[PDB]
């Protein structure tokens, strides 16, 4: 759960980026973070769903 939206945990995506994180510029870090909590669960707030 994040800001009224249900998003996917970075684990269900398709990437190994943990390696990179430590060398990131405050800027780059931020960008990526948004991309992460960017990918949402489309339908999200619906319940029922399936």
């Amino acid at each position: 759960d994040h800001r009224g939206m249900e998003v996917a945990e970075p684990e269900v995506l398709g990437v190994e980026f943990k390696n990179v994180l430590p060398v990131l510029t405050a800027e780059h870090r931020a960008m990526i973070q948004n991309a992460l909590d960017g990918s949402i669960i489309e339908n999200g707030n619906v319940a029922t769903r399936d």
Partner: protein, 349 residues
């Protein structure tokens, strides 16, 4: 009261962002709507949702905006609908400091309140001599009995002065008494070929001169006249002469449509049709105001309330557009679906 209006505006604008259902909202929005809606539903006892879908949900929300729109404008519409009912308490919701308002909304009101409460110079809309009863043929000589110089109106923004050879005189008084200008912008010309009392073509010889407050001015150039200086014309020529002095435009301390940014486009929006529902609503609302219920006022309003009301209503209009509300008002018989220019025309009584 500025604050109240600002909020009511902010809220409506926010609801306008709900174009679709599953879309992500701008953080700022959710924050506002939340506090607002809850507090509203609190003092209202209504069931507004932050994410409407049904219709009845949308109606409820629209009703909310409407409730606020009216309250902010201080309008009591009365029993106009079997579906909608105005809750006077809405005002208390707009007065709660907890509900914020955008910077946009703040500045917006500050502008309205600002200009409305004071005056300023503005390019007036119509010709200077528009409110004239008598007008003369342009280019036709005319000398009033016993006068050597005879100035007279020949159009809404036109005057011509008939001069006898060797004659001269002040003209200003033809302008004075009308309106209350601050600066009249003139441009005079010589009527090179004009009609004589009998009908014969007469020439105006080069050499005639017009001077304001003593200083001589060129023809075909714009002159900043204060309306009080001496408007003196001289005909040193050995023939009759006729000159046309034109009020290209003037400025007064009256309110024009340029008092507030794109006020025009807003007014258009309010007065636009959309459908019988919107129409009848917008109408019935203005019936509580000094504004024409369905036709753009000839003259631009000048009081806070009017300007405000227009803006609010204009916005509530857009809200109506996105929300697609559906309900009835007493005396409104809606034709659904395919609307045509024709059907619209007919709607304006």
């Amino acid at each position: 009261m500025d604050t109240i209006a600002a909020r009511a505006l902010t809220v409506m604008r926010a609801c306008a962002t709900l174009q679709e259902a599953r879309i992500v909202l701008e953080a700022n929005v959710m924050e506002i709507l939340g506090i607002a809606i809850n507090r509203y539903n609190g003092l209202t006892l209504r069931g507004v949702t932050m994410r409407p879908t049904s219709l009845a949900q949308r109606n409820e929300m629209f009703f909310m905006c409407l409730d606020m729109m009216l309250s902010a404008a201080g309008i009591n519409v009365g029993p106009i609908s079997p579906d909608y009912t105005q809750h006077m308490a809405t005002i208390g919701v707009l007065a709660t400091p907890e509900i914020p308002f955008t910077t946009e909304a703040a500045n917006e009101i500050a502008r309205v309140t600002g200009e409305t409460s004071t005056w300023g110079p503005a390019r007036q809309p119509y010709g200077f001599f528009l409110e004239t009863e008598e007008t003369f043929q342009p280019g036709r000589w005319f000398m009033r009995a016993a006068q050597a110089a005879t100035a007279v109106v020949c159009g809404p923004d036109m005057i011509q002065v008939s001069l006898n050879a060797g004659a001269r005189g002040d003209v200003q008084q033809i302008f004075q008494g009308r309106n209350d200008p601050m600066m009249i912008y003139l441009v005079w010309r010589r009527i090179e070929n004009f009609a004589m009392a009998q009908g014969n073509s007469q020439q105006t010889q080069a050499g005639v001169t017009v001077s304001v407050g003593g200083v001589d001015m060129r023809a075909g150039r714009i002159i900043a006249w204060d309306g009080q200086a001496a408007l003196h014309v001289r005909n040193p020529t050995q023939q009759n002469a006729m000159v046309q002095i034109q009020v290209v435009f003037y400025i007064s301390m009256d309110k024009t449509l340029n008092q507030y940014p794109a006020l025009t486009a807003e007014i258009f929006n309010v007065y636009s049709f959309r459908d019988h529902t919107w129409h009848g609503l917008r109408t019935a609302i203005r019936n509580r105001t000094t504004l024409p219920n369905m036709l753009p006022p000839i003259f631009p309003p000048n009081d806070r309330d009017s300007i405000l009301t227009l803006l609010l209503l204009s916005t509530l209009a857009d809200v109506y557009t996105v929300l697609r509300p559906e309900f009835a008002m007493h005396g409104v018989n809606p034709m659904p679906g395919p609307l045509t220019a024709a059907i619209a025309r007919a709607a304006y009584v």
